[PDB]
């Protein structure tokens, strides 16, 4: 496996129960092993959907170095808060927003100053489980975050092998090519595009009717 990505496997994730209450901490490696997921290990995560002024969504294609879903197209950023004081903060989901700011800089090279927590809109949470291969997989309650800004980019090639802003029609053609096997997409992107994505995209200026901090949608 890629050395840089192997080093990130030692990061401490936040373990949660099924209602997103923190119950412990565990390494990223252990949180993504199917053998631990099969026993119910679950951690907190987030997914960013970043739109620019032209109302295009910023997608990334994961690098081939990623241990789970390498080379797959997905939304702007999908990662997780760490088990440290700053990112465990539950007030107004500030820990998750701080982690999103941190990873947007680490993966896409977006300056910390362009995406401070006050620019990151927490919409709702989705619970899902998937397998990448026989060894690795995912099991998380994902905080869906939305950003609307014309950021600057300087991505880390270790993280992504490409990025692109897409209009709604372009995302639709992308999804068609994924159905043909032409390209691959991640499960969390597939789930969200099939459920809430186009709904939020049509109301970027009035996301209020779409905010739900109470329910955890079980996908
Ligand atoms: Mg995860």
Swiss-Prot record:
GO cellular component, one term: cytosol
Domain Nudix hydrolase: 41-191
GO terms of biological process kind: cholesterol biosynthetic process; dimethylallyl diphosphate biosynthetic process; isopentenyl diphosphate biosynthetic process; isoprenoid biosynthetic process; response to stilbenoid
Cofactor binding remark: Binds 1 Mg(2+) ion per subunit.
Principal subcellular localisation of the protein: other
Residues spanned by motif Microbody targeting signal: 217-219
Requisite cofactors: Mg(2+)
GO MF annotations, alphabetized: isopentenyl-diphosphate delta-isomerase activity; magnesium ion binding; manganese ion binding; metal ion binding
Known catalytic reactions: isopentenyl diphosphate = dimethylallyl diphosphate
Keywords for this protein: Acetylation, Cholesterol biosynthesis, Cholesterol metabolism, Isomerase, Isoprene biosynthesis, Lipid biosynthesis, Lipid metabolism, Magnesium, Metal-binding, Peroxisome, Steroid biosynthesis, Steroid metabolism, Sterol biosynthesis, Sterol metabolism
Record EC number: 5.3.3.2
Keyword Lipid metabolism: yes
Location of N6-acetyllysine modifications: 168
Keyword Magnesium: yes
Ranges in a coiled coil: none
Pathway: Isoprenoid biosynthesis; dimethylallyl diphosphate biosynthesis; dimethylallyl diphosphate from isopentenyl diphosphate: step 1/1
Entry binding sites for substrate: 28, 62, 66, 79
Active-site residues, Swiss-Prot/TrEMBL: 78, 140
Highest taxon listed in the record's lineage: Eukaryota
Positions bound to Mg(2+): 32, 43, 138, 140
InterPro entries named in the record: IsopentenylPP_isomerase_typ1, NUDIX_hydrolase-like_dom_sf, NUDIX_hydrolase_dom
Purpose: Catalyzes the 1,3-allylic rearrangement of the homoallylic substrate isopentenyl (IPP) to its highly electrophilic allylic isomer, dimethylallyl diphosphate (DMAPP).
Assembly: Monomer.
NCBIfam families: IPP_isom_1
Entry's family note: Belongs to the IPP isomerase type 1 family.
Protein name: Isopentenyl-diphosphate Delta-isomerase 1
Native source organism of the sequence: Homo sapiens (Human)
Gene this chain is encoded by: IDI1
């Amino acid at each position: 496996l890629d050395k840089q990505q192997v080093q990130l496997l030692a990061e401490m994730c936040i373990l949660i129960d099924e209602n997103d209450n923190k119950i412990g901490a565990e390494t990223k490696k252990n949180c993504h092993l199917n053998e631990n997921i099969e026993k119910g290990l679950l951690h907190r995560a987030f997914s960013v959907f970043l739109f620019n002024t032209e109302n295009k969504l910023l997608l990334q294609q994961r690098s081939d170095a990623k241990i789970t879903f390498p080379g797959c197209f997905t939304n702007t950023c999908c990662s997780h808060p760490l088990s440290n004081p700053a990112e465990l903060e539950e007030s107004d989901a500030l820990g998750v927003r701080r982690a999103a700011q941190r990873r947007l800089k680490a993966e896409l090279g977006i300056p910390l100053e362009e995406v401070p927590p006050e620019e990151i809109n927490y919409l709702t949470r989705i619970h899902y489980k998937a397998q990448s291969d026989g060894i690795w997989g995912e099991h998380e309650i994902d905080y869906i975050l939305l950003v609307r800004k014309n950021v600057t980019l300087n991505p880390d090639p270790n993280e992504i092998k490409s990025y692109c802003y897409v209009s709604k029609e372009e995302l639709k053609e992308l999804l068609k090519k994924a159905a043909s096997g032409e390209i691959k997409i991640t499960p969390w992107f597939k789930i969200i595009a099939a459920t809430f994505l186009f709904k939020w995209w049509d109301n970027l200026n009035h996301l209020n009717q779409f905010v739900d901090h109470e329910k955890i949608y079980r996908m």
